[PDB]
């Protein structure tokens, strides 16, 4: 897997 | 003065952190997020259907509504939620928050919903980014800094290990040597460093700058850069199934490396090799594009290798290397  | 631990534990393949929070006398697993400012949660207000797997936050129990303020975010992955909002009393290893604003989903992507790992997200970049309407709110963070021993939180993110997110005291057994600080610049409220050079394996280039983010798996880097590492590893090809560049698990992968204030940051190879790509025998990498947005992303592989100190005086960001 993610991009948070 | 208060200071805590909260112990965090990875997901399959290290792919998130989850960290227990009490909201209301329930506690919810979230995912702490550094490159974002909103304390969101599964809620009672989702459809029953999504709030299945999940531990979720009911409003009306405890919260008090803040009437006609709303939220709405998105993330880099393409992910969104939104909702209302209450304040709550949240406890996070031991410290407690009172009056917390906490953001009640009511709608929530199809990443979300796929996801049971997690119960929502606690931001923890700059209070400036956070996106309650009309007016925003603190994080966490802001909003128990004053009460705490210092004004920083730091964290040991491990390679299929529990780690810890220490908050108003540094642990110095979490590391080795001395911490080594970089200025941060918080204008587009990211924990945002400059990197003076890189060193991928045998190619060493210039800086860049980049942010530290406790909410992106991988480490994301300019497609130079990406090109130039995977250029020494035998065998590496895109394979868009899984998601970038794949290679070999037994492959022997280089180490990168950049240059902080003076102080070498490595990561070793080992903790490049993120896991199987899950399409045949191949593993995926650590490091991947980062669309070409013009900064990096040092997401969870940069961050296993490093004890991080995020300290609200500067700012300022200290590094040392995990013990
Ligand atoms: C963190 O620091 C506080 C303030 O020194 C202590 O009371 C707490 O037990 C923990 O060591």
Same mark, same amino acid.
């Given at each position: 897997?993610?991009?948070? | 003065? =208060?200071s805590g631990?909260?112990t965090?534990?990875?997901? %399959?393949?290290?792919?998130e952190?989850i960290?227990?929070?009490? &909201? !209301?006398?329930?506690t919810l697993?979230?995912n702490?997020?550094?490159?974002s400012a909103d304390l ?12 299945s797997? #999940? ?5 009306? %129990? ?10 709405? &975010?998105?993330y880099?992955?393409? +992910?969104?939620?939104?909702? /209302? ?5 949240v406890?996070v290893?031991?410290v407690? =928050?009172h ?8 709608? *929530?992507? %199809? ?8 119960? !929502?997200?606690?931001?923890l970049?700059?209070?400036? *980014? ?12 802001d ?8 004004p920083?939180?730091?964290? =040991?993110?491990? #390679?299929?290990?529990?780690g810890?997110?220490?908050?108003? $005291? &540094? ?5 080795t ?5 970089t ?5 587009? !409220?990211?924990?945002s ?6 060193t991928a ?10 942010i ?8 994301l880097?300019?497609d ?8 020494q ?9 899984? !998601?970038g560049y794949?290679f070999?698990?037994?492959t022997?992968?280089?180490d990168?490396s950049?240059?902080i +204030?003076?102080?070498?940051a490595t990561?070793?190879? +080992?903790?490049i090799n ?11 990498g650590? @490091?991947?594009? /980062?669309?070409? &947005?013009?900064?990096? @992303?040092?997401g969870? @592989? $940069? ?8 300290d ?7 590094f040392a290397?995990?013990?």
């Amino acid at each position: 897997x993610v991009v948070x | 003065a =208060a200071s805590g631990v909260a112990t965090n534990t990875p997901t %399959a393949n290290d792919e998130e952190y989850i960290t227990p929070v009490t &909201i !209301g006398g329930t506690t919810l697993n979230l995912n702490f997020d550094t490159g974002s400012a909103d304390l969101w949660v599964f809620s009672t207000e989702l459809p029953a259907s999504q709030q299945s797997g #999940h531990s979720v936050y009911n409003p009306s %129990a405890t919260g008090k509504e803040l009437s006609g303020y709303t939220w709405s &975010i998105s993330y880099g992955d393409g +992910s969104s939620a939104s909702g /209302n909002v209450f304040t709550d009393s949240v406890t996070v290893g031991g410290v407690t =928050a009172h009056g917390q604003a906490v953001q009640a989903a009511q709608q *929530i992507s %199809a990443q979300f919903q796929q996801d049971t790992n997690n119960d !929502g997200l606690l931001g923890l970049a700059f209070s400036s *980014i956070n996106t309650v309407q009309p007016q925003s709110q603190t994080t966490f963070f802001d909003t128990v800094k004053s009460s705490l021993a210092q004004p920083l939180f730091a964290v =040991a993110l491990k #390679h299929q290990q529990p780690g810890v997110y220490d908050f108003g $005291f &540094i642990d110095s057994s979490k590391y080795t040597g001395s911490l080594t600080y970089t200025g941060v610049d918080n204008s587009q !409220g990211f924990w945002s460093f400059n990197v003076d050079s890189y060193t991928a394996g045998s190619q060493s280039g210039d800086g860049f700058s980049g942010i530290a983010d406790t909410g992106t798996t991988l480490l994301l880097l300019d497609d130079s850069v990406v090109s130039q590492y995977y250029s020494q590893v035998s065998g590496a090809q895109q394979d868009s199934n899984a !998601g970038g560049y794949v290679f070999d698990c037994s492959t022997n992968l280089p180490d990168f490396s950049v240059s902080i +204030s003076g102080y070498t940051a490595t990561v070793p190879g +080992s903790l490049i090799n993120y896991g199987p790509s899950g399409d045949g025998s191949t593993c995926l990498g650590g @490091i991947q594009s /980062n669309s070409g &947005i013009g900064f990096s @992303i040092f997401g969870d @592989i $940069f961050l296993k290798s490093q004890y991080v100190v995020f300290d609200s005086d500067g700012p300022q960001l200290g590094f040392a290397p995990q013990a």
